[PDB]
């Protein structure tokens, strides 16, 4: 029921001149937007990516981001000159911004910044702040960034008002895609070293249940791997069971998933 909306920015600064900024946007585990460095405009990756924004509202929003990208790029470059020679290129910066949507018109917005792959800075309330563990030198950038009242007011409106509204509309518009059910297909294999593998692929959404079973006995030696993505926005998972050779017969792989609607997949070795 709870969906997290994530705008993810990746910025690489190799030297004083060369830089690139790339962005992707997620609603839950579905990609809604893409913004390549090479592109002047934000790309929709779904038909419903504009949500319930009118063309005029979207154009105004995109323009704000266009100004931001150019500005952010110059700001980092200038902050590097300002801290010289404490910090140096290359520099990787990541931004994670968005809002978590709760039922009954509740939401929490966030804007987190990582420097060289470490969370250092967030926007909180009405200002930028460092987080615990952040280096002291960041106090000067924070002081400069907090001097810009215009950015502060813009971000506040962006986090407090724009995000929750936009996402509410996204949830309405993308309802059918968010609630789609895709059936998993399973298959079995084995690698002697023996280890039995149960492959489960093509399922959506993410929640799934996979256990190796002898009859009705749950084999506690089952090791669930990570969730791996397919290209078609479905998921892949495998569960491995370590067995003694000769004791194969009797083992089955049971898969429960919401898309099957009661009809569990059972595959006997």
């Amino acid at each position, epitope marked *: 029921k709870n969906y997290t909306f994530r705008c993810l920015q990746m910025s690489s600064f190799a030297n004083r001149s060369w830089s690139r900024t790339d962005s992707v946007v997620w609603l839950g585990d579905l990609q809604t937007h893409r913004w390549s460095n090479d592109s002047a405009t934000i790309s929709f990756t779904k038909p419903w990516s504009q949500g319930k924004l009118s063309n005029q509202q979207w154009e105004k929003l995109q323009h704000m981001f266009q100004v931001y990208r150019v500005s952010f790029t110059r*700001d980092i470059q200038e902050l590097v000159k300002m801290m010289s020679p404490k910090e140096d290129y290359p520099i990787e910066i990541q931004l994670s911004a968005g809002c978590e949507m709760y039922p009954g018109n509740a939401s929490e917005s966030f804007l987190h910044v990582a420097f060289q792959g470490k969370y250092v800075v967030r926007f909180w309330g009405t200002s930028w702040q460092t987080v615990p563990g952040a280096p002291s030198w960041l106090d000067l950038p924070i002081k400069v960034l907090n*001097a810009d009242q215009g950015t502060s007011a813009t971000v506040q409106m962006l986090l407090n008002d724009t995000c929750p509204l936009f996402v509410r509309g996204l949830l309405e518009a993308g309802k059918s895609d968010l609630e789609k059910q895709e059936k998993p297909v399973a298959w079995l294999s084995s690698v002697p070293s023996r280890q039995l593998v149960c492959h489960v692929s093509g399922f959506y959404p993410k929640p799934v249940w996979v256990m190796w079973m002898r009859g009705d006995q749950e084999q506690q030696g089952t090791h669930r791997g990570d969730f791996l993505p397919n290209a078609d926005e479905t998921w892949y998972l495998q569960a491995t069971l370590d067995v003694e050779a000769g004791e194969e017969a009797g083992l089955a792989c049971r898969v429960k998933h919401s898309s099957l609607g009661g009809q569990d997949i059972i595959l006997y070795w």
Partner: T-cell receptor
Amino acid sequence: EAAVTQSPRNKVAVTGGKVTLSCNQTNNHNNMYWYRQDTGHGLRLIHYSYGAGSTEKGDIPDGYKASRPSQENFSLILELATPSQTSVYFCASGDEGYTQYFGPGTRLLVLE
Amino acid sequence: TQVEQSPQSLVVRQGENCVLQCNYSVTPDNHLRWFKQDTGKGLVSLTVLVDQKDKTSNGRYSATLDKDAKHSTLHITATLLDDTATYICVVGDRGSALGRLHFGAGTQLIVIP
């Protein structure tokens, strides 16, 4: 209240000669900026500084060198003066805010 | 140049009002400042406009800013001899020291006493 001083206020120099324009500020501002003003143009940024030991190229840095030996002092150095550097030079300082506080200006004439 | 001023120059008689204008293409446009510069002197800040549709006043000086149009005017009411000067429009692209200033070339005003 935040005052900036420039010296000298007026200078006659020869081509190939060395000229140093000095800027002093007692406001404890990190940031200092050198500009030149020429007819038919707005003020154009030559060099700036974010602190002691720091100098940065502006829009038109060619033929100029900058020097920030201390927080108080920002120098503009013309190693080999040319007539094209005949101009009025303005220094400014500021903190983290957007306001720049301008000095009274320096008139430079480079004769052949 | 991203900041253009009009008129280039003008002559008015004491007691008359005049309008000076500034058109810019600076992006972004955090704020706009008007300077008075007496001949052979420094820059005296007259006003700073910051809002989308801003209006300011400073004695006989008043100014408007329209960010949508990227246009500003400075009004001088009841000119005096001492208004004889160059009026310079400056746009700042940031609300902080990370900003660059964009200077107009100015408007020369002469007031005949």
